[PDB]
Curated annotation (Swiss-Prot):
Record flagged with keyword rRNA-binding: yes
UniProt-reported outcome of changing R103A: Loss of substrate rRNA binding
Phenotype upon loss of function: Depletion of EMG1 affects growth and leads to strong ribosome biogenesis defects, with defects in 20S pre-rRNA and mature 18S rRNA species.
Species whose genome carries this gene: Saccharomyces cerevisiae (strain ATCC 204508 / S288c)
Pfam families: EMG1 (PF03587)
One GO MF term: rRNA (pseudouridine) methyltransferase activity
Protein name: Ribosomal RNA small subunit methyltransferase NEP1
Length: 218
């Protein structure tokens, strides 16, 4: 099938992997920039903020990792973003995330201000701010789990293979530098670890994609 239909929140049925990048650090400031600890340390200090929390680069790298993956190219992946200010974003699987941080910031600034980004020539949304909670958008049958260092370690393939034939898997991954992995406790009934080492979010995203790709023969 050279053309798998693009997965969106409107399909409640198709079995897929969903990744939610939670506590994402995406905040605009008119100086419009995305605030970040590399460029805006003095400012963040003056705002009384923990400098280390301003990490939009984490969300940027997780997006590049997830959207480049074989599972995305196979049409079996969705990504949502929950920012630390409570904004929910649905990412269209076909969207092109710029490699440079500068252009990613420009894109996110437009998204946060206009509330969507339309498809260039064709005219449907490539990124859209949507109403909370995430659970109004996920497939009807969908296992929900948080990835955490503090949790028992699983092999992704084992985990994925034990899903029912119609059951999606939604994984919540912290898009932050630090903090408790409690960001999705309202949504999940299970937490799993993927390694005996603390990982970056991009690595944890990558491990989970690889195990799904393997299990699903992608
Ligand atoms: C760099 S960690 C930051 C937050 C983490 N609680 C901490 O304090 O170090 C970013 C995210 O990657 C995931 N992660 C990090 N290590 C992991 C591991 N060993 N197994 C599963 N997920 C992990 C978690 O979802 C985590 O929130």
């Amino acid at each position: 099938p050279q053309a798998p239909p693009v997965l969106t929140s409107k399909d409640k049925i198709t079995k897929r992997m969903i990744v939610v990048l939670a506590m994402a650090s995406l905040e605009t400031h008119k100086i419009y920039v995305l605030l970040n600890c590399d460029d805006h340390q003095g400012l963040l200090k003056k705002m009384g903020r923990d400098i280390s929390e301003a990490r939009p680069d984490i969300t940027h790298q997780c997006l590049l990792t997830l959207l480049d993956s074989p599972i995305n190219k196979a049409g079996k992946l969705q990504v949502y973003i929950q920012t630390s200010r409570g904004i929910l974003i649905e990412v269209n699987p076909t969207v092109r995330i710029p490699r440079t941080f500068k252009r990613f910031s420009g894109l996110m600034v437009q998204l946060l201000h206009k509330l969507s980004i339309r498809s260039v020539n064709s005219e449907e949304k490539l990124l859209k701010v949507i109403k909370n909670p995430i659970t109004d958008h996920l497939p009807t049958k969908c296992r929900k789990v948080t990835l955490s260092f503090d949790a028992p370690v699983i092999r992704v393939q084992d985990y994925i293979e034990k899903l029912d034939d119609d059951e999606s898997i939604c994984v919540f991954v912290g898009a932050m530098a630090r903090g408790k992995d409690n960001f999705a406790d309202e949504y999940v009934d299970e937490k799993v670890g993927l390694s005996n080492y603390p990982l970056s979010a991009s690595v944890a995203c990558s491990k989970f994609c690889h195990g799904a790709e393997d299990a699903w023969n992608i």
